[PDB]
Amino acid sequence: LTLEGIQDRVLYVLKLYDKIDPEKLSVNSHFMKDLGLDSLDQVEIIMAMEDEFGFEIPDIDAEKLMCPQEIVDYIADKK
């Protein structure tokens, strides 16, 4: 799979989600202080990951991602 495919599909479903403010969607785009989200909203983002680009994501690892660089890297070596 194309690694930039992982990049713009993680980035893409981060753009598909509606409650977030697409202001600082970096690779260090954090959730609680960068975008101001609860952990419920964080697993809501995990729900916004597994729906298109995911389906194998474990709960111990989805608890502590917190930035889409770690997401792209983790699905990158996960596949």
Add this chain to the structure above:
Amino acid sequence: AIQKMTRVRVVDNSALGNSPYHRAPRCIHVYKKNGVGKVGDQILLAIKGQKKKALIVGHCMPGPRMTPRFDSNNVVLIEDNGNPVGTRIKTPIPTSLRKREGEYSKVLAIAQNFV
């Protein structure tokens, strides 16, 4: 048999029931030709100077056999249009409400328990 003038133990999460009051709620009218109500009849009821339609859920005189008999006159409030005032019903409700002709489907969505 819940006739006129009978004291009534309201089982609801309603504002009218669980509010304290100096008069016990008591029946005024029974909506049958004879003035005797059984499990699954509508009555008027005096709560806090407010008459209010109500539905009899179990009484103290014995009915048929396999049906239950309560130690109070449990009654669920209802509005004029037919939807109940209450939100939860704690005391168990007999399943004998299911067969009778009238508004019972609305109340059986509310029961915690079934006897």
Add this chain to the structure above:
Amino acid sequence: APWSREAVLSLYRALLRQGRQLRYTDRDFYFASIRREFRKNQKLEDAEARERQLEKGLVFLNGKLGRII
């Protein structure tokens, strides 16, 4: 203040994993109802009520009192 840390989000994501195994109903009203069970309830509560509401979350997960299809 809840039962633990990981258990709450674990039951959350578990209810979502049943949320995709949902078959017959409008799954977005379902998910919004999961929100309204979790957003407006799990903010600013005492540590005892956290326990009871995560226990009704447990029972709502297991579904021996009925399951949403």
Add this chain to the structure above:
Amino acid sequence: KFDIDMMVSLLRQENARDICVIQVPPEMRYTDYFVIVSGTSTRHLHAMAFYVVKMYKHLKCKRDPHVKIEGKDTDDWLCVDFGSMVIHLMLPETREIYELEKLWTLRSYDD
């Protein structure tokens, strides 16, 4: 036959506004399937009520009892019970205040 699949056909074919059912376990001896469905207005809920009793009545099951629509005069609530299942046509505000989806999953674990 007239199963819950056929009910999903009747309600998505009507385009019911909101659907949420609960499989009631056999111990709590009310029903098997507990349908919660909302619509637009009294005309909508009323018409889709007469639609689903029209399709059940016309469909099959002669020996099974004819089914009366409950609460034809009230506006917000409507409810119809079958052998296996019972549908509740109501409003989502009425759903908000009666919170039935909590009850039939949390039988003693709610308010």
Add this chain to the structure above:
Amino acid sequence: RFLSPEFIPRRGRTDPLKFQIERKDMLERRKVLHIPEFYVGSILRVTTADPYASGKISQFLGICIQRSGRGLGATFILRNVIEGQGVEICFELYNPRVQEIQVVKLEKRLDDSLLYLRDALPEYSTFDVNMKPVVQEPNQKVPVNELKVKMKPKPWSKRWERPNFNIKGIRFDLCLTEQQMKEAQKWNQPWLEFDMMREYDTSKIEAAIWKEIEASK
């Protein structure tokens, strides 16, 4: 030997052939369903089909507080309180929508009818729904539980103090005055225990019934 009370007829000028017929049907039901020995103190759980649910069954647990009725139509009414509410059900023992009658705790109380439990404290009437059936040993008489209960205040269901009831399971000393006790000893009827024409002797009745039991085997 324990012969259940529904087989013993009340006296009366009915024909014995009618009880031959009834006992025939009662034993033909006792092939299918196992009717156990139980007294008027014992805790029971009964599974019944529901006429209102589509072939779903149910379980009620409580105290058998009365064993009234003779013949095929004989009942027992059991009591329990749940949700701070007292409920009783009259169960017909031979209604074919009963599937099992399990005896949780076989025990005999001091009385023959515990209808006074409606006026006792609700702790004397409450039970666990999921309580486990206590194991009894095969070859032993029954544990006669005595428990003089405590009574709620005076306006009872019936005047249980009166000696026509012969109630034994009351701590009367806690809940009744000596003056009202001596008033209640007015309705004594001391002769009534001593007349020999009111005594219905079911002995030869028991004999012919046990040959009805053995002959159905």
